[PDB]
Each structure stands twice: as structure tokens, then as C-alpha cells.
Amino acid sequence: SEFQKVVVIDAKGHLLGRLASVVAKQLLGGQKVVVVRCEELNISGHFFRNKLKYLAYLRKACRYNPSRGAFHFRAPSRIFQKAVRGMLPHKTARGQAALEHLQAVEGIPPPFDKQKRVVVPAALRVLRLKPGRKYCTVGRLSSEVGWKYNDIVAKLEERRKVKSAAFYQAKLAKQKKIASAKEASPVNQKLSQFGY
Amino acid sequence: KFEQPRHGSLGFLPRKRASRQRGKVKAFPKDDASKPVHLTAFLGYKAGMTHIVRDLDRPGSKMHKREILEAVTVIETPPMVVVGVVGYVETPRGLRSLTTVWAEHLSEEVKRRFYKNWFKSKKKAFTKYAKKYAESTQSINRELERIKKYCSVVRVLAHTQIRKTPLAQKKAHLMEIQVNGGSVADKVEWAREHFEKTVDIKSTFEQNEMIDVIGVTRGKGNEGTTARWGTKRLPRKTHRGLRKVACIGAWHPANVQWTVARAGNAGYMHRTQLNSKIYRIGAGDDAKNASTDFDATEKRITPMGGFVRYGVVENDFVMLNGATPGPVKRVLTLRKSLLTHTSRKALEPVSLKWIDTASKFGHGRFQTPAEAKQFLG
RNA sequence: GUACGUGAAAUUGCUGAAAGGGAAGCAUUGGAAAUCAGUCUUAUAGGUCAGCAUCAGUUUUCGGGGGCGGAAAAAGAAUAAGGGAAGGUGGC
RNA sequence: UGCCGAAGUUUCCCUCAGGAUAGCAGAAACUCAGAUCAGUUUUAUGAGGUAAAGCGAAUGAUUAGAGGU
RNA sequence: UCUAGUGGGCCAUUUUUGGUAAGCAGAACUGGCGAUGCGGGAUGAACCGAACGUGAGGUUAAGGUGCCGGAAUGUACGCUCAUCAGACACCAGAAAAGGUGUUAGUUCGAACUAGCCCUGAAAAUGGAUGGCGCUUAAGCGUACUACCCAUACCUCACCGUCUGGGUUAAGAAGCUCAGACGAGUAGGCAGGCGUGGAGGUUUGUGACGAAGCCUUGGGCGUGAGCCUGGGUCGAACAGCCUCUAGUG
RNA sequence: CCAAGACGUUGCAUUCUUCGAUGUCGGCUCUUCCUAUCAUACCGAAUUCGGUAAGCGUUGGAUUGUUCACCCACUAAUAGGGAACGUGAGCUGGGUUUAGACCGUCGUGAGACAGGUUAGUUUUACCCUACUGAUGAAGU
RNA sequence: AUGCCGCGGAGCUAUCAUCUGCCGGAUAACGGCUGAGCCAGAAUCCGUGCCAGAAAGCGACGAUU
Questions:
Q1: Which of A81, A122, A138, A167 would be a feasible disulfide site paired with A76, CB 3.0-4.6 Å?
Q2: For residue A40, what is the DSSP state?
Q3: How far is CA A103 from the centre of its chain?
Q4: For A64, nearest residue in chain B (alpha carbons)
Q5: B100: how many CB neighbours lie within 10 A of its CB?
Q6: How far apart are the C-alpha atoms of A28 and A21, rounded to whole Å?
Q7: Which of A150, A125, A137 is CA-nearest to residue A46?
Q8: B255 neighbourhood in chain A, CB within 8 Å
């Protein structure tokens, strides 16, 4: 257990409910949480079943003024926020104030692409679903129910990945130089019996 | 026991007054880099409307190669002045205006757009912008380079020379026109080189194009459900009134539904009427613009006595097939059609035989005063 | 000050304070702000709140040593025998 | 504020939206006493015709042959 | 011995009658509700646990521990893929028969027998395992620990009632020790609080301000209520013992 | 479901609420939902029958107060059902409809008739909400 | 209580007059491919198109007493 000022979570390969439950508990603990790459979130069950579930969600509306009726957000970040909102006591000022500590986004915008992004093992698809079980991605589900910025995020994410890769090569070179100069120091053996 | 379809469309409500007087182009044609750089919109003023006689060259029709009479709408379209450019960058949340570059010199007509009270103001708009444009063009150059490098959509700010039209209004109408065709670099170069210059509708539209006309319809004020929604009039025996909807809902749900006809504003709404052919783009200077080839009789588009409540059209005009939204002297937006169309009706060439310029302020009987003096003793 | 003793509540205006995202009011607990009293001040003894120590009562939570019981646990180890087969080791 | 705390059931009534009556219940007492008792068990001993069981037992209903006529 | 209230009942278990059926009518035994809060069943008069004075600490029942929600995103072995899966008794409802579904079993490749799933299955505002969601479950079956918390249980403090033991050295109508117990409608009884008037009493209060009135002030009592500071006011009023009633 | 679609078999009155009052049928008007599909679209089986499918549509008249009904037409077709048996501060008042009156039957009579027949006052929104339009303070 | 009659511009208005009203994607039924996955296929669903613009969503820009 550890407390960070803000936690940026790479939502790739995570399960919607498992991550939303972990995030919702952290928000109620008073911690600010940022969730990036919401279009890569996974849901158990094949897509068609998930698509039918969301079409059932679209059916809910007020018989008078659907503008009062339930607002069905299509963006993957908004889907994740909806799952978290159903896990927070949002009608209450405590659970409402815990919502503005959550910022779910699609892709990794500039303020967060230069920050460490941790993952939640309790919500990872590889560690939770038996192999061979069908699953869908929220990004593809959103693109079929109305979300219309799928390929823009894909292009911007590809460009960001290239830039991040170039940074990593620079960091690898610097760390390689540090490691090479590390062993030359005689203290490396003077620290050996201490376990360092 | 019986059925009847719904009265009215549910896709047009709320039936509230438009929040804008000038039509907003809500969609622009898909950008094709193969096509050359061009404008995809224009802004004119509804002068009036008249009727023409045309030989119908549609094979297989019952009236092929025989005369027909069609009502046409004349819109005065003096050339628009390109005063600026604005860049749009695509984002995961939509288009975002990255930056805007204005021309060095802006006319008084477009400057009046920025003031509610131009008379009392010191007319100080864009003064410091003009100063920085003259003293340091490098900042402008960086702005244009930024548009070329990051922006994926380019729109030219254009205003209309409203002082050329016979209108008491002096604020020039200003809009953004998306520039499709070519690379973003080509669009910026086209925009910058066209700062402070004028673009004529002859360059944009080609005398047969199917365009969309966008404008705010004529306001009818508040109306009842009989007129606003077309419901049936209740019988003469009705108590407390008959020009209304009898039942406004069932017991449950215990509310009036949004789908029930009610009274209120019926008019002054934003419409985008599709598939309007240009029958003729006439030049202002030419004195034979309304005269066809089978008619001779050198004459102008303006009927005798002038366009009712508009005056005399002296500038470039466009003659469209059928009606357009809005009253006379209303600002209308003509945009290129978004859909493709290969119909024989949409592709047949148009060759007019005669254009009516008798007085519309009554029952006109003479086309021109020259033959009016002939008939009258 | 005759619209006259006292001049209540409903209701109302002004001022000050605070609250208010489709009711309000209420109970418990504390924060914040406001407000206030006891108490001491004194006659070795005494005011308010704290920290530890040694005890008592209640309870909770970790650990150690020992006795007895069982097929006087079952197993196992080391070391002597007999017999056995394999899902067959070396040798074929 | 403190202590105790129900009934919708019996019998009769031109009774069936009500009374009287017995029960439940509250106060006030009086006696009795290791007694006289218990919504209990045990030991001893009675009583009953329900569940089941039966139709090659009475009565009642019903299946099938074989024998003796 | 005298008297009140009641003399419309209702629900659940099991047994059962009339009825095509019923949240139907009528009975028998017991427990509940009416009269009864509290923890759990999302919610609910009678379902499950448990019955209640004011509090502190500890521990539990029924039920639960992914989030909402206090408490293991525990352990072990399995089954299930559902194009609108499943999710805890009462209970919010479903069948025969089926399956080139799958996991097992039984008997001679075959017939089967069993679980889960699917089909059978078929409505009207948008919508309910309580919601979110959940798929080597956060589903289903079984075992196993740890943990969560009721006004229940346990130790303790205090309040009251009742009960028993002391008290000629202590408003003896007093003092003192000890134990048990605490739900309540209709109803009963006891002791108190407050209002108007009468007898007695207080060397009683008062124009140096009685009574009354207002008060983001202070104190007392379990409570009815009482006392008091500040302001307003202007001629009377109260405590104790008893009497009385057009007394809340 | 079963094999000779017969025979079987399995499924999709009560009096609890209201008598200090919930306006009582039909039509007209207007909206919405369901599918158990009349037409249209898409395939599949020999002008005839099914599957997905409720997107869109589903009429004009004669009689009758009628919901059902029945007729003459048209139509691609003139499917069915829910909405407090949708809809009276929405309408009309034809059915129902107290008092007037007539007839038939019944009664000694007053009267009765779930038989017929004519005439017979249909109140109120300015409140809250909802809906329909119209302004509008304030972050930046 | 617009005396009446003919015509009557302007405005309003008439399916009594005129104009205008389309192609993308995933699919259900169902047919295939290889041996799940993919392809084909409806007036269906979802988007382009169209209307509103969050009065407590947002950006660019102009001038700044």
C-alpha cells in the first residue's frame, strides 16, 4: 500500500469492471487518479454480446423529453467513467467530490505522455481470464455505437509511440554509459556484503 | 379503428427561433487532394424571384423538347472579399481552431461587424494588428507556417460587399469558407495570396451545379397547433376553442410528451434546402444578363419598378431553380452539394428561352419600357 | 400624541449573519465560526489538559517450556535380512 | 414520569355496527409454608380406532384364466 | 373482593374442508402481528436472528466481505459460454419433450442415466441479481480458515422498580448493605409538574420597579416544569402547610 | 411432445382499496408502445405456405348511439392489441340520463318493468408540475 | 354599430399554387469459405446528412477606458 499525489494508469489490457472497482476505491480514499488509453480497455464476453448490452442501454430514455432521459455517452473514457460513477455514491457530496479526482482520457495526451504509467495486476486481462475466452475492446465497441474519433486517436498514438521510442533509445544510451562507469568504481565490491 | 401518420417531422424540433440570422454551414464537402484549390461556399442576398420559360431536353419525358414554365429565385451575389484565414487541427475531441491570420487592411464594412455601436466607437479594431503586420511580418510568417505544419483544415474568412447591394444595412456579413483541394500548404498559399482580393461566384459555381441553399426562414411569429403543426380543426360545436389539439396525452405517463403538438413559435428557423440548380450566373456589368439567345431584347434581370422591397440588382446574381428559405433581402448561403448525383434531371444542361421581367408589384403586362411606350398611345 | 396603559403570536419591511444544483424541517457525532460560564487566582494543600510508571477489573493478540494420551501416533532415517515385480535402470 | 398490561372467544338476547355473561387484566387485601404444586421428564397402569396395513378375513367395487358343472 | 378494557381480528408452520381457481371462504395445534422497536431478507405488520432503561469496552446471531458498504479481488477441487447467462430460503414465479452443447457415469459402436447451459419461452412509458459491473467470476456445488456487526450475550459505571438483610446510635416519612429485573396499544394504579380562588404561615417581594412581555445570555430536573442575567414595562405579587375548582 | 394428424398428454368468482364523491359508453381529436405481420424489403419450401422484420403505411362511404358486425367501393394493404376496458377543468351528449308524459305486461292500489317511447342546465385553472415557445444574473 | 355592389395592388395563404427530400457501415434470417475466423445478405440497428447547442462543455481572434 502506497499513496501517490496522482496516479496515471495505463488502461490497456485492463478489464472495465475490475479497473473501475479499483479506481473507485482509490478515489474514495482521497487519491487523484488519471486513467489513460481508455480505448484499449477490455471487457469479458464476445463483442456481439457487449454490443447488445450497450444497445439495451441506448433503449433507456424518458418517454417525455429524452433530453431529460439517460445520457448515453459513447466515448471509451466516458464509458469507463460511467462504470466508476456507478461504483461511487455520486448523489452524495462525498462520492461526487471523489469524481473530480478521476480523469479518464482516450490515448495519452501531452501532459501525461511524459509521466510514469502504472498498471493494476488485479484488473489485467491476462491474469484474470482463462485463455480461449472471447473478449472485446471498448475502443471497437465505441466505434460501432457512435464514437467517431477512433482513427484520429490511432494516428496520434502511433506518432506518440515513435517519439516515446526515440526517448527510450536516448535513455538506454545514457543508462548504458552509467552502467559501464558503474563497475569501474571500487565501491561496488565494498557494497557487496551489504547486498547492494 | 383508424390510423393516421404523425403530423409533422420530429427531426426539426425544437421549433424555436434560430439563434443566428445568417445560415451556418454545418457540413463541408469531403476534401479531395486531387482536385485543385477552390472555395466550397458563397454568401448572397435574396433579391426576389421570377419565372422563366425553358425547353425541356429530357428524353423519355412526356414534354421532351417542349416549353415549360419554372419559378426561379434571384440572389444578388456581389464578390466576396477574402480578409483572413483560420486553421483547424483534428483532435480526439473534434476540430480545434489553432490560429487565425487576418489581412493587413480591413475595410470599414467588415470592421462594422465587430461593433454594435460603430458611430460612437473610436474605430480601433485591428489597428494594433495592422501595426504589427507592417512592422514585423515574421510573426505572421510563423503563424502561416504553423497552419501549414499542424492544421489539417483551412478556412478563409470572407466578407460581403454589402454596400454594393441596395440594402440599408452597412455591417458586412462575414463567414468561414472551407478551402478544399490540394495540400494544406497549397490552401495556405492560396489564402495568403488572396488576402484583400475578391472572389467572384463565376469561379466557384458553374451555371449548372446542384448546390444547397442555407438560410433562416421567414418568421411567422407564434402560431397554434392547427397552423404550426397541421392538426385537424375541431368541430364548430366545440366549447372553449377548436384550433388546438384535443387530447395532449394519456393518463400514464402522467406528463405531456415532447411528441405532442403545441402552440408557439412557427417560423424563423434554420433550414438547409438541398438540390437547387443554378439556372444562370449573370454578370453585373453585362446589360444583356436577363436576355436569352432566343429572345434578344437587351434587358436586365430587375423587373420594372424594381424588385419588390429590394430594389435594382446591379451586381453579379444567381438564378436558382424554385424556392429558397427566407424572405427577400435575407442573407443566404450557397454551398456545394455534399452528395453525388447522376440523375438526368440533375445533369441536363439548361438553356433558357425567355425570362419574365414584368413588374411583380401588381399584374405586370410589359417586359420593358421600350415596348410599353409602343403599346401605350 | 386621542390610530392613546401593557402591546404577545400569525404575518410584514429594513438591517446584520449564514445557507441554497428538483422541497424543507429532524436525530447522532465532530469541524468551523460566534458566544459564554464555571474553575482557579488562594488557604503543605489545591485549577485545566496531558505523558510515563507500578497496580486492579474486563478483554484482545503473538510467543515459549513441560506433562499425558493414540497402532504407548502413522510415517521416516541410519543399519542388518528375506521376498517382489515394474510405469524396465545397467546390460540386448 | 414510574409500575403492571389485554381482548376479538363461551352462553343468552328481534342479537349480527350493540349489550349482559364467563375469560383475559389492574388495584386492595387476607391466609398458608417446606409446603402443595407444575403447558416437563421418568417409573407403574389405563383409554382411543387416525396414519399405515389388509382384500387367498367380514361387507362393498373390480382383472384374468384353469378346474368342478 | 371490586372494577376497567375487549367481545370486527390478521399472518406463518403442519393437518385439512368447500372451490376450475384466488393476495378466496371455513376450521384444528403452536408461534408471531395487532401492542414491537432493533440486526439481516435492496425495500415490506406478522420471514430469519433477536425482544428494548442510560452509556463504555469485548464477543456473537441471522446475514454477509469486488465497488456502492463495515469486512479475504481469501484457500482447495470442479462445472458453466448463454445473439439479451447466472446469481441465496419465504419471494415475486414456469412444464412435458428436446440438443451433432458439454462434463461425467451405467450397460450391452450403441442405447441410455445424470449435472450445467440452450431450445421449448409468447406484450405493450425506459429499467432493474438493489445499482455498477462480473466470465481460471464478483456465477454454480462442496470443504476450509480469517474477518465484519444488532438495542442479543458478557464485565463495568449510573438511573428506576421490586426483593431480602441491617439501623436507639438517625427531616426512623431517616440512614445503610445486597441481588434480580427494565417492550408496550385498549386499560388499570402510584408519585409528581403547572393554573384560578380560601384558611394558616413566612420580622415574605415591591414605584430604589409587582405582574406581564421579548431575549443569537447562564443554571437545575428523566420529564411535566422551575430559577436567573439583559431589555420593555408600570401596581401589585409570591414560597411552605392545607382547602377548593368553570384547573393544562 | 408421442405413432395410428385421431388417440392421449405438457404449456401460454372474490370484496383487498375507494361511499366527508377517483365524473359512468361510443364517436371526434391527438400521441405513443407491443408483435401474436395485412401490405412493403430480404431469403427459403410445392398463383400456396414459412423465417428474419414493427422501418413506413394500414382508406372513402350506407345503416345502427353501439365496441363488435354487415354491405357497396377503392387500395400495395385496408393486421391485431396496450396505454385507469388511453383520451369529458379536450369536445359532442347519440347510448346511459332523477323529476314531465305515453304504451304494453304485472299489481285491489300506491307503484313495478335488467320492456318500448319522446322531452330533459355537461361548472372552474390565474396554483404546482409537465409540455410548448420567450427572456435571463453569474465562472472564464 | 365597416350601408351595399364591381375590380382591387400589398401582405397572408392553398397537396386549390410552386420547389425540395441520399449513401456508408455492422448485421438478423440465411447462403458460403477454409477447416472457430472470414465473406455474402433485409425496408433492421449505427453513423454521413438534417434540427437543437450543454443557458455551470470548449477553442481561436479583435480591441482593452
A1: A138
A2: G
A3: 10
A4: B257
A5: 14
A6: 11
A7: A137
A8: 63-64
Q: How many whole angstroms separate alpha carbon B233 and alpha carbon B26?
A: 37
Distance CA A132, CA A130 (A): 6
- Give the position of cell 404523425: B6
- Residue by residue, DSSP assigns A16-36 as HHHHHHHHHHHHHTT-EEEEE
Q: Which residue carries 480601433 as its cell?
A: B124
Interface of A with B in 47-76 (CB under 8 A): 63-67
Contacts of A153 in chain B (CB under 8 A): 92
Task: Determine, for residues A152 and B256 on separate chains, whether the beta-carbon distance falls below 8 Å.
Answer: no
* CA of B229, C1' of E139: distance in angstroms: 53
What count of residues does chain B have? 377
Residues 6+ apart with CB under 8 A from B319: B52, B72, B73, B74, B278, B279, B280, B281, B282, B301, B355
Residues of chain A contacting residue B93, judged by C-beta atoms under 8 Å apart: 149
Give yes or no for CB of B58 within 7 Å of strand G. no
Q: Where are chain A's structural domains?
A: 1-150, 151-196
| Cα angle, residue B66 at apex, residues B299 and B51 outer, rounded to 5° | 40
Q: Which of A81, A84, A80, A82 is nearest to A70 (CA)?
A: A82
Q: State the residue for C-alpha cell 480461449.
A: A132
- Would the CB atoms of B255 and A64 count as touching at under 8 Å? yes
What resolution in angstroms does the PDB record give? Answer: 3.1
Q: Find which of B16, B88, B255 to mutate to test the A interface (most A CBs within 10 Å of its CB).
A: B255
From the CA of A57, how many Å to the nearest CA of chain B? Answer: 21
Taking the C-alpha atoms of residue B334 and residue B350, their distance in angstroms, rounded to an integer, is 19
- Residue B343 phi/psi, 5-degree rounding, is -70, 150
Contact, B306 vs B312, CB < 8 A? yes
Per-window interface: A 154-183 vs B, CB < 8 A: 156
Q: What is the CA radius of gyration of chain B?
A: 25
Of chain B residues 202-231, which have a beta carbon within 7 Å of strand F? Answer: 222, 231
Whether residue B283 contacts residue B316, with contact meaning beta carbons closer than 8 Å, is answered with yes
Q: How far is CA B253 from CA A62, A63, B96, B249, B376, in A?
A: 10, 8, 42, 8, 72
